[PDB]
Ligand binder design. Sequence first.
Ligand SMILES: CC(=O)SC[C@@H](CCCc1ccccc1)P(=O)(O)O
Ligand SMILES: [Cl-]
Ligand SMILES: [Zn+2]
Length: 230
Amino acid sequence: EYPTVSEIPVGEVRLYQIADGVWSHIATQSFDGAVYPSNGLIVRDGDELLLIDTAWGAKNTAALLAEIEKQIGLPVTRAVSTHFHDDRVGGVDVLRAAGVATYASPSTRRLAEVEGNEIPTHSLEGLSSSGDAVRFGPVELFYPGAAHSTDNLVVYVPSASVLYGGCAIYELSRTSAGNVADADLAEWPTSIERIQQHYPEAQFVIPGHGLPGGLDLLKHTTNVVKAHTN
Ligand SMILES: CC(=O)SC[C@@H](CCCc1ccccc1)P(=O)(O)O
Ligand SMILES: [Cl-]
Ligand SMILES: [Zn+2]
């Protein structure tokens, strides 16, 4: 039932209902000669929607907006990018053109600029230090410390017990650390431990790519990371 990479042509986007008022979005994109799936989140915010992460590229993010309008029919009014790479901010210009207010931490914005990526407009205050959390509409944003990248954020939806890990959390079947160019391998397991301590009651955990699962994804991710340091 959760859609997989072979099922989603590049340029198409799927929505998957996780709970009342909470969806993931799934899209696909080419990276270094292969196509990969990628997850974001959508959360009902009263009469509006909160989007977590783009659908990895302008074309995909436009298909995401059209899919939302077709299937849900509420406006996306705000979007948060959880780190600075193109699967998370690629498409921000499309969001902004569509009337969406785009957000990221000051760190994410700076890194996106240096990288030549699209830059979310607004800075999120209060996420400077490992362990910092802030409320943002119907979610909590948490900076666990450096992991997949130095700036990566995770997102918790307390009304549904949904934890979105972005690229700091791997799916259960993934045994190989993927893109780790900007990762901090020594800090990653500590950052996971912070997530674990802060969200011990999470029921659904969404990795940045692939199948959702449970809190077992956190331990699994640490295992893969520790294995790729030995
Ligand atoms: C592992 C990630 O989430 S990194 C973001 C890259 C996507 C990498 C996706 C991926 C997933 C599993 C294995 C290899 C690559 P980019 O934005 O630079 O294209
Ligand atoms: Cl990138
Ligand atoms: Zn990344």
